[model samples]
Target: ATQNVVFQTLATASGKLVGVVTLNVEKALNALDLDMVRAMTVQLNLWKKDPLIACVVLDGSGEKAFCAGGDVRALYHASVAAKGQVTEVAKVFFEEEYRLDYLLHTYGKPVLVWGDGIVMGGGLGLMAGASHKVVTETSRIAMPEVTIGLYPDVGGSYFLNRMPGKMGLFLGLTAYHMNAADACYVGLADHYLNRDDKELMFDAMATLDWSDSPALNHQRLDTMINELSNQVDIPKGDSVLAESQEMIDRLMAGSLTDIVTRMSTLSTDEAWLSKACATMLAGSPISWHLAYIQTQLGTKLSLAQCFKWELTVSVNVCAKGDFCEGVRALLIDKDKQPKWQFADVQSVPNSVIEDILTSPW
Candidate 1:
């Protein structure tokens, strides 16, 4: 069997090495599994302390996707097979995943992510904290956990809450798709490099001076990327967040029922915004409730706090709510119809949502 992740080393002109990690499971669109997480964590830890490696770049095999998301279907099955209790698999996966994500957030050396194609959920978590985030024109970024009856996990609570205005709240509720321009507009991605620019980027990386000082190397890396940015085919779409911020802010101030009414009855001149509202209306009611509350709470908490709370929510979602049903409908049975716990946002009580947010941990 092929390893889910492939690790390679490229030497600079000065003989210092830059590490490259590729997500190799293209068959499943490189969806993250426990093994993938473990492999990445171990290799990243090794590279972090190695003097020969000046920086690390993470990308995926195939142009179809960087990584679609996590292996949530397995997580759902593990939870169901355990008969309503938290499974060991669930605990280990979330714990290690969060730890690795936090590691990236605070990594000592520069980390570059070539975030191309579909980068959603767990994939977004991995790339979001990198020192250098590169999005191609083909990039499609989202945190569409609501469709599967899961709130966005993997530091989503930390980062999503921090997007400008009510943008984070809007995205979590709607699970809207973001083009490369939208990604930059919302601060999720740092650079908008074209797909054709990737080879040029590698060539640039090969020539960079890998000094002993990480700060100097970081500065040099940014300078190199900015130079390369001049060649990028700028994204063609208008900024979704920028255009919709005032509208989103206006609706966001209303009560949950009021907000749902607006979304349900929404009409827009922009096709994308209209589609997003429809997507929002399609998501699980309980998910909508939880996402709203979590974003509000996330704004007031540290990243660690967000992760801790999210773990509790995730475990319960599998055990007590719509996660299994959502997974069955979407992945297992392919039914395309999830029997949600709360049929509508108005039907989902605050206490049920609160139970997920308040952690025993």
Candidate 2:
């Protein structure tokens, strides 16, 4: 597991330390499994207690992804192997994964996440909670769980709810990919650094006078990163989520069925919005319902509570619903034609949605 996620401390010239944790599973796009999460938590927990470790930097080992997401296909297989009983593996994976996410959110030391390439699903979960989250030109971020008959789990409830102008709700519904500029505008990313200029960022961190206090150290790290990366710019593009906030809010302002009915009428000549509408309507009715409810409910719950509720949804998704069929069509069969049980919003029973959201105990 240590080989899966390597941890080392950089010795500053000032005799201080900065911890670095790298995700080494590039061949799988660094997609997380239990071992990867365990390795990270072990190192992170140690760094949390070590006063000498002034800061931490988390990144992936390749150019393809920070992490594509969790390895839920394995869970899909496990549940099938167990005859529809949610595997213990699924339970442990979500629990530890959420625990690590919560740890990063309230970490005692300054933690910086190098979010380059595809950061989606659980990857976004890790990057979202870091104190200093950096995105580069190559960053392509989304929570595309709806396509697979799952809502955005892994703290999507917390971050998506907090996005300004109700844009988070728009993103959750559409699963639209956002560039670095959009991420910054939506508060998902903190700094925009050029992918090629990572050397400059490392140099800046090496020279900073880190403080003992976590807050002061975080400030210094932020200042150093800005000084080095202030020149790099996100590629210019028309803003979809931000500009469509009002329309999205109005369209989404109704019951699940009303929202579906309204969004169905959406037609746009603009490529992005049209594609987003197509995507929003293509996903499972059950998944969109869960996503909409969670995003709204998340605004009132604590982060821990968000994780708890999402975990319940995850297990239920495995045990009694569309996840297996979704994965088979999308990943296994390569058919891309999932026969969702509830094919349309009007047919999907709200009673079933409630039963799925019911307590897992």
Candidate 3:
């Protein structure tokens, strides 16, 4: 069996090295498993302290995806085995995953992510925290947890709340697929480079005059990426998020109930907006509440605080909420029908939301 993650060190011209971490599970779109999280955490910590390691690059195997999401199939099984209790898998998975994300965000050395192809949920978590995020024309990013009976997590609360205007709220609720331009518009990606230029970018990195000081090396990396990005032609069209900003802000502004009502009644010829509305209507009601409340609460919280709060909600959702059923419908049975605990957005009791948000620690 192939290792879930492949770690390598490439030597630079100045004798400094770039630590490369690849999500190696292409068959599953590199969906994060507990072992992958643990391996990355340990390796990153080691790289953080190594003076010769000037920076780190993270990517996924295959051309299709960086990472689709977490290993929810595994979690679903774990939840079933636990039988209505918060399973050990749920607890440790969230903890370690969040911890790894936190490290990536705070790591002193520059961390660059090749945010190419499918990036969602936990995948976004990893990319959002990196110092340099490069999105290719193929990049397709979203936080589609609403479909899975879970709220946006893996630092979703932190990044989602930081997006322009009510864009975060709209995205969290709608699960819209964002192209590279859309990602850059939402502040989720920094640079846009063509996918075909990947090898060229790597060769350029190996030639850079890497230095011992992380700050200097960060500036070097920025200059290099700016040069490369300027050379590439971004083939994607204008951002849908940018074009529809006024409408998204208007639609996502009101209370969750009010927003839900608007989405339920919305009719438009714009395919993107229409699809977003349809997704919001088809998604889990409890997920709507969770996304709404989490983004609101996250407005005032730090990244670390957001992760801690999300952990509580995630474990609770696994234990007593609609997560298992959502996974069953979407992944296991492929029935495309989830019998959610609540019938609609308004039907979900505030107490259930509060209880899920409560700390089990």
Candidate 4:
């Protein structure tokens, strides 16, 4: 079998190396699988400790996506095969995936993610923690876990809460797709470069005079990226997130109930706002409750803490919540219609939400 993740080392000008990780399952849009996660985790750790490695560059194989999301269809099948119980596959997948994400967040050396195309859910998880996040004009990003009855698990609790105003809450519930400008506006991306400039950026990376010190190397990488970014024209138009900030803040404010009511009745000629509202209405009600609770509780928590809490919630949701049904309808059955566990957010029991949040570990 072909490797799910392809590892490579590029020799820089000063004899230092830049480790490259490519998510290789392009046919599935590079959706992360257990094997891919495992391979990446081990290789990234190796690069972290290797003195010759100055930095790391991560991206997907295809032009279509850096990564679309996790291999939820696999998880769904694993759950069904286990008779709706938490199987070892589900436990290990979440644990190892969180470990990999945490590794990137704390990796001392600069970790640059070429967020060139579709980056969603698990893909966003990988990018969110990188020291350098680059979004190209073609980048389409979101945390659309609500569509699959999953709360954004790849450290969504940490980063989602950190977004401007109540935008995080709004995004978590609505699964709003963000463009390059929107990504930069929401602090998800640091540098915006044209997709065509990616090779030029790499060529520049190969010429950098890398240093022994990670801090200095980070600065060098930042300066290089900034210079390259300055040369490219703004890829996309104005950011919807920026323009609708006040409206989003107002709509996402007050109680969860209030927000739900407002979104349900939301009428706008604006296609984005209307689509967001329609997505929330059609999504899993239990997921809305999860997103609301996770974002609120994650406010004061550290990234590590957020991951722990999310693991608990994710495992529980996979085993006992609406995850299976959501995946079945969306992926397996090819039906856009999902018969959610509850009719709406108000109908989901608080006790059930509490149970999913409870940590078994």
Whole-model Cα lDDT per candidate? 0.84, 0.83, 0.90, 0.90
Error of 1 at 99 (Å): 1.0
The digit string of per-residue lDDT tens for model 4 on 1-361 reads 2388899998888899999999998899999988888889888999999999999999999799999999887789898787657778788989999999999999999999999999999999999999999999899999999988998779988888888998888888889999999999999999899999988988998999899999999999999999998788765678999999999999988888999998887788999999999988888889989888876684788889988888889998998788898999899998778998889878899898988888766
Write candidate 3's Cα lDDT for 216-241 as tens digits: 98899999999998888766668989
TM-score, structure 3 vs. true: 0.98
Pairs that collide in candidate 3 are: none
Error of 4 at 85 (Å): 2.5
Sequence-dependent TM-score of model 2: 0.95
How are the candidates ranked when ordered by lDDT, highest leading?
3, 4, 1, 2
Q: Candidate 2 vs candidate 3: which has greater lDDT?
A: 3
The pairs that clash in candidate 2 are: none
* Tens digit of per-residue lDDT, candidate 2, span 232-306: 755535456677678878877877778778778877787877777788788778888888787668477899999
Candidate 1: stretches off by over 4 Å: 233-237
How badly does each model clash, as a count of residue pairs? 0, 0, 0, 0
lDDT of 1 at 188: 88
Badly placed stretches (over 4 Å) of model 2 are 233-238
**Residue-wise lDDT of candidate 1 within 1-361, one digit each (tens)?**
2399999998899788999999988999988898888888999999999999999999999998998899887787787887766667777888889988989988889999999899998999899899888988899999888888887788888887888877888888878889888998988888878888889999999999879998999899999998988766664367767887897898776667788888887677888778788877877888787777766674678878888877888877777667888788888999878888778877877787667666646
